Structures are given as C-alpha cells and as structure tokens.
Symmetry: C3
Subunit: 247 residues, 3 copies
C-alpha cells in the first residue's frame, strides 16, 4: 500500500476528514439539532446551565425565581428567599434579612449552536414579574438581538454564537426567554403543511438539561469540553471543536 | 403659547391621549401581548397566581397537585399531602391525617387581557388524574367557555375578561388548563406559512410568572395595580386602567 | 314488550353496544384524545407515571434527573443524589456515597392510547446530559420506533400500544422524550391553516399527570383499572377495556 500522509490514497485520512465534515454538515441539515444554552453566573462562582436541544427551532423560558441559585441538598434559606422574591416583585414588598440576594444572577450568557440562523434569534429580557417592557400594553413580546451575537471562532470555524450581558446593578432583576430557529437556506418551509406536524412533535421531543456547576473551570471541563459544546469564558477564551473539512 | 386646556393647541394634552391610545391599540395589534392569569384561592385567604404572557396565543396547564397551596419555606406536611393526593386520585387510596386538605383551592378565577378573542377561549377543567370528562374515551379535550366570561369594565372600557368558579364541595378536585388566542380581525393567518415559525417561537418566548400572595388585598396592591393588570375581587369590584381615547 | 335478549327490539341492549362503540370511535375521531404514559420502574418496586392527554398530538420530555425516584415527604438524600447526578453527567465527576443510585429507573414502559398512529411515534432516548446520540453534531433528534410497539389486545381489540425496555446495566443512564400523533385517516391536515391555531391551543390545553405508586399492583388497581387505561404488567398480562361493537 501507499505510505501514510504522502499521497491521495490515504483513505484513512480522507475518511477522517469526511467523518468530521459529515457531522458539521449534518448538524446544519434540517435533520439536525439546533441547541441553546443559557448560563446564569452567581457571585459564589457557580454557574447554572439551562440547555435545550431540538430540531427546527429551540428555546428556553425562565422567570426571576427560576434563574436564582439553588444549592441542591444545602441550605437555601427558602423562606427568606421567598421574601426576597416578594421584595423584588414590588419595592418594599417583602421582609427578607438582606438587601441583595446572592442567589441573583450576576450575568447571563446565551450561546447557540452553529446551526442557528442568527436573524431568527429572539429574546424577552423582562422585569421581575415577567413583563417584557415594564407594562404589557407597551410590550413587544421579544427583541431581535442577533446583531449583538459574537461568533465563537476556533481554527477559523464558527463553532457557536454568544450574547453576554452582565447584571451588576441592584435593579438588574430579570425574567428571560430566548428562541432561535435552525438554519434553513432552502425555500422549503419546515412548518408548512407537508411537515408542520413534525415541528409540533419537535416541541414534544426537545431534550432539556439543567445543572449548577460549582465553577467555570468545572463547567468547561465536565460539560462544555466533554460534549463538544461551544463556550466563551470570562477571559474571552473560545472553546469548541472545528469540524468542517478538518481531520 | 396658548393656555392649557382651552384650545386645540394643547399638544401636551393631545400627546397624552395618543400615548394611552397607542398602548391600548398596540396591545390589540398582532405585535401585542395576549395574557392569561389563573388565580387559585385558598381557605387561609392566600392566592396563588399563575400568569403567562405571549404573542399570538397563550395558555396555562395545571394538574391537581400543582394547584395546591405551597407555603415556600414553611411547613407543608409533604408526606401527609402526598397521601392526600393518593386519596384524591382514587377514593380511599391514601392515609392522610385529614378529611379535607386546606391546600385545595376553594375557587378559581381565570382572567384574560382585553386583547383576547373570547370566542377562542378553551378550558379543560378535568378530574384529579387529569382527564377532562371522567374517562379519556368520552372526553372532548376542552370546553369553549367564552360565553361565560364577564367583561371587566372600568370607565366604560373593557380592561379584561373574567371567568370565576368556586370549588366549595368536597368533590371539587380538579386539574385545569386554559387557552386563548390573541384578537385577529384581519384575514391574515398568523400561523399560516408566512409567519408560522414565529408562532412556534412565541411558544418558546412566552414569559411565565407564579407567586402566592398572602391575601387578595396584597395581590390587588402589589401585583394587579402595580402592573396595570385587570382584576375582579370578591366584592365584585373592578380593577384596571382605561386607556383608549383617554388621558 | 319483547323479552330481554331474545329479539331485535332489545333497545337497552342496542343502546349499550352503541354507547361503547361511540366512545371507542369518538376517541379515534379528530375531536378525541391521544394519550401517552411513560412508566419508570424503580428497584424498590415503586413506579413513577408521567401522563399527558391531548388533542391532535401528545408528548412527554424528561431528563436524567427528572426520571429519578423521588419519595415525596421522605428522605431522598438530596445532596448525595446531586453528587450522583454530577458523577453520571461525567465519569468521576462527583463524590456520592454510592456506586449505583437506587433512584435510577430499572426500566421504562411507554404506552400509547389506541388512538395513536404508530407510524408517527418518535423517541429521543438520550444520554445523561440530554443528547440523543452521544454528540449533538451526529444526532438525529429522534428515532421512529413504532415497529417495536406491541399491541395490547383484550378480547381481540387493540386497547393500546406498548414499548418496553429495561435499563439493567450501570451505563443505562438516560434522558427521554416521546411523541405520538393522533390517528388521522382523512386527508384533512389538522395543522394546515384552517385549523392550525387549534393545534397550538392543544399544546396549551394538554393535561399532565404525575405520581409515584408504591408498586405495580397499586398502579394497576388505582390508576390503570380505575380510569380504563391500557397496561401490560411484568408477567405480560394485558389490561384495558374493549369497547368497539361490545356490550
Ligand atoms: N495553515 C497553517 N498552519 C500552520 C502554519 N504554521 C503552523 N501551523 C499550525 O498547523 C495547523 C494546521 O495544520 P493543517 O491542518 O495540517 O494544515 P491546513 O492549512 O489545515 O491544510 P489541510 O488540512 O491539509 O487542507 C494550524 O492549526 C497551526 O496551528 C502555517 O504556516 N499555516
Ligand atoms: N362624562 C361625564 N363625566 C362626569 C360628569 N360629571 C362628573 N364626571 C366625572 O368626570 C369624568 C370624565 O371627565 P373627562 O374625561 O374630562 O370627560 P370625557 O367625557 O371623557 O370627555 P373627553 O375626555 O374630553 O373626550 C368621569 O370619570 C366622571 O367621574 C358628567 O356629567 N359627564
Ligand atoms: N365468541 C365466543 N365466546 C365464547 C365461546 N365460549 C365461551 N365464550 C365466552 O363468551 C364471551 C363472548 O360472549 P358474547 O360477547 O356474548 O359473544 P360475541 O361473540 O361477542 O357475539 P355478539 O356480541 O352477540 O355479537 C367471550 O369473551 C368468551 O370468554 C365461544 O364459543 N365463542
Ligand atoms: N501560523 C499560521 N500561519 C498561517 N495560517 C495559520 C497559522 N495558524 C493557524 N492558521 C490557519 O488560520 C486559520 C485560522 O486559524 P486560527 O488559529 O487563527 O483560528 P482561531 O483559533 O480563531 O485563532 P485565535 O483564537 O488565535 O484568534 C486556520 O485555517 C488555520 O489553519
Ligand atoms: N356622572 C356622569 N355622567 C355622565 N357620564 C359619566 C358620569 N360618570 C362617568 N361617566 C361616563 O360614563 C362612561 C362610563 O363610565 P363609568 O364610570 O360608568 O364606568 P364604570 O367604572 O364601568 O362604572 P361602574 O364601575 O360604576 O359601573 C364613561 O365614558 C364616563 O366618562
Ligand atoms: N372459547 C372461545 N371460542 C371462540 N371464540 C372466543 C372464545 N373465547 C373468546 N373468544 C372470542 O375471540 C376473540 C378474541 O378474544 P380473546 O379472549 O382471545 O382475546 P384476548 O383477551 O386477546 O385473549 P388472550 O388474552 O387470552 O390472548 C373475541 O372476539 C372473543 O369473543
Ligand atoms: Cl436537509
Ligand atoms: Cl398588526
Ligand atoms: Cl373527525
Ligand atoms: Mg486542515
Ligand atoms: Mg375622557
Ligand atoms: Mg360481543
């Protein structure tokens, strides 16, 4: 046989490159996943991830309470934190023993898989009682924020998209929903009658994941890297696995 | 300049009236919210609200368990109340220490924003195991109850719609889902192929809110009134903010 | 009058047969329910049921954590079980006091009502972090498993469909979503524009039920049999109520 890495008959080499290319392009096919991660960062350094993986379109919807840090199996002062909720839903509306709950997110990162079309991204960053813009009567139910999404590049390939905003002020008390649609460069509407019921089933079939990791290092190591997910850390370091045309 | 309140050149006055009119009519545009509140009233006077706010259509789905009173951070006798659940799912099916759980709702109020079309309202008021009408085989999955919805009028304007039913009998053990569609007097189908994927995204983007307020006064003060929501209290008093054509 | 059971004028007899036939065929009409049960079996003999009942289509979506046994109001070692979660999401990723959590399901049974079309059934049996097939890039978001569904026959009638798989190995750590579409032998697309918004409302109106029964006997007695649901027990015994053309 020919010698490895010296000719066009390194079929092992060609097959490796095709395997990676097939995965990248399958993901971008209408058969492929579109994935969304919402990361809530807490002052103790831990990070809640909410993930959804689905065909055609994907989303996550959270309220003020559901974004708050919960240390499973540890003390979370639930009565006091309910009083925090009451005090955040209406000024002077509760009697907690604290001014600022350390369970409040300090920041949010939204990351999409590279199979999203950024022009379809929508976000409702609402107030603490789940209104998009102060009052329902004046609220568009979303903002289209795609132009703010940064490309996560690795080795010249887009491995994902990130929108990051901090919540450093005392009044940064939010509710949050996010939605994105899978790329479709064809003119075949996946939600027209020939395929519409499959998009309804995709709403059923969407897989969700949630966990609170004790720090960003642990998240990077045992979540992001373990499962070939894209990420951007606090030092602007990019994570992900480039696949198209690559060995 | 002209003197305030004496001529057609009170532009401040005209702008105020337009601001309010724009909010009312924006809410009724296809860009606007449609909102649903389900209020569960408990014997201790507290009130659970479940709220969802979304474009195009909106709904809430609850089971017997999820409607039960939960006092966050206080004693809820969870084992005993699981035995209540077992005893309510099947007669003589549990061993709780009580005949009637005070966590059971005594009444339900359903309120829609004025941007709902009442002809589209649907409700599945089911039994304790989440069947609409005793057995699945005979169950239509909803009832269309719009004709029972009362207009909440303030200053001659419809600020919302209410359907209220008490659950005063021991056998009033329910599951509950409710759905309504945003007004659309145009013939443009928001869920036809030109816009269908946006209605799917609206399912993602819908913002939800839940809280248990200690009484109806507190609910009126720090929830309803605070956020310009419609309401009807036990004394048939109407709450809401009239906007169309008004300063 | 004629004597009972001796002539074609036993109208009581004819009405009984029609009552049962009407229920069976109503269930199969587009007005009827389609229902899904996911049963998670635990080593202590208890069984979690997740049920959804809806028009047009139905589904259930669970993650690794949500399938785990929870004994309401009893000790569940929540910190230790969070460490189990960490150790199952990534090998050697936690520090629980155990090798195998007895809260892990030992098996799953999926049962559909007889009103499902088995060709529409889809399942995403994913890994512990809610990826269908190890990595998102290579994942079709479902498998179509209808050919594996067994008919639950009683008295020669199909009363439901079952797919059952055990999880007996230590590496059988899963996430799970399932979806099925209601029979529609007509060419009228229930999700084409004439009726599409009603299918969106059906997503709102779907009723859900969850409970953990202490054993299969109790499940059979107070859940399955009580509410005329189909079932298949560990001894391959079939349960359900035959209705079509029957008294
Ligand atoms: N492209 C490129 N890579 C370099 C160079 N010098 C060092 N490198 C490293 O080599 C890596 C690329 O190697 P290859 O993947 O084999 O080269 P390639 O440009 O991708 O070409 P093919 O994969 O064969 O089509 C990069 O990730 C760099 O870190 C250079 O001059 N050009
Ligand atoms: N319309 C009306 N309001 C009265 C009358 N007497 C007292 N009011 C009070 O005045 C309020 C209405 O005042 P306005 O809003 O300035 O009058 P309007 O009828 O709405 O007329 P415009 O807003 O200028 O178009 C009502 O809410 C009443 O409580 C009356 O005779 N007619
Ligand atoms: N069909 C049938 N059933 C039998 C026979 N012997 C005993 N059985 C029992 O009788 C039951 C059926 O009785 P029926 O329902 O009155 O008879 P059928 O065949 O359904 O006929 P119709 O309901 O009158 O149309 C079955 O469930 C059997 O358990 C037999 O020879 N033929
Ligand atoms: N020294 C080099 N000279 C020429 N091309 C390079 C070199 N290093 C990498 N490349 C190529 O440049 C392209 C972009 O790779 P690069 O490493 O810059 O991506 P990146 O990870 O986004 O970079 P960075 O994260 O440092 O901004 C790839 O096609 C890669 O093969
Ligand atoms: N004394 C009055 N004479 C004439 N018109 C009035 C008077 N008070 C209010 N109105 C007008 O009548 C219309 C209805 O207002 P009204 O106060 O009756 O509404 P409402 O809050 O639904 O009343 P209620 O709650 O007392 O039944 C409004 O256009 C308002 O401007
Ligand atoms: N002894 C019998 N002779 C003839 N027909 C019978 C007899 N018993 C039942 N049947 C008929 O046969 C058909 C199938 O009934 P059967 O009792 O076999 O259903 P099944 O409950 O699926 O059976 P099994 O669970 O024992 O496999 C029905 O129409 C029934 O009326
Ligand atoms: Cl494709
Ligand atoms: Cl419009
Ligand atoms: Cl029909
Ligand atoms: Mg290369
Ligand atoms: Mg006026
Ligand atoms: Mg018979």
């Amino acid at each position: 046989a020919d010698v490895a890495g010296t000719s066009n008959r390194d079929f092992r080499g060609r097959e490796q490159r095709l395997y990676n290319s097939e995965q990248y392009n399958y993901n971008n096919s209408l058969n492929g996943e579109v994935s969304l991660w919402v990361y809530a960062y807490y002052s103790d350094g831990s990070v809640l991830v909410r993930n959804c993986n689905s065909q055609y379109k994907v989303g996550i919807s959270e309220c003020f309470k559901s974004l708050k840090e919960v240390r499973v199996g540890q003390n979370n002062d639930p009565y006091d934190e309910q009083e925090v909720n009451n005090g955040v839903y209406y000024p002077n509306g509760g009697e907690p023993t604290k001014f600022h709950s350390n369970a409040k997110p300090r920041a949010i990162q939204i990351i999409f898989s590279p199979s999203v079309n950024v022009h379809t991204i929508k976000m409702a960053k609402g107030n603490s009682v789940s209104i998009p813009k102060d009052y329902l009567q004046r609220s568009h139910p979303w903002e289209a924020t795609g132009v703010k999404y940064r490309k996560i590049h690795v080795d010249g390939e887009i491995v994902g998209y990130s929108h990051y905003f901090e919540l450093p002020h005392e009044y940064n008390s939010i509710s949050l929903s996010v939605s994105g649609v899978h790329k479709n460069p064809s003119s075949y509407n996946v939600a027209a009658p020939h395929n519409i019921m499959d998009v309804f089933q995709s709403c059923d079939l969407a897989l969700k994941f949630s966990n609170r990791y004790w720090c960003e290092l642990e998240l990077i190591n045992h979540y992001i890297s373990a499962y070939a997910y894209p990420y951007l850390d606090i030092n602007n370091h990019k994570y992900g696995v480039p696949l198209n045309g690559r060995q």
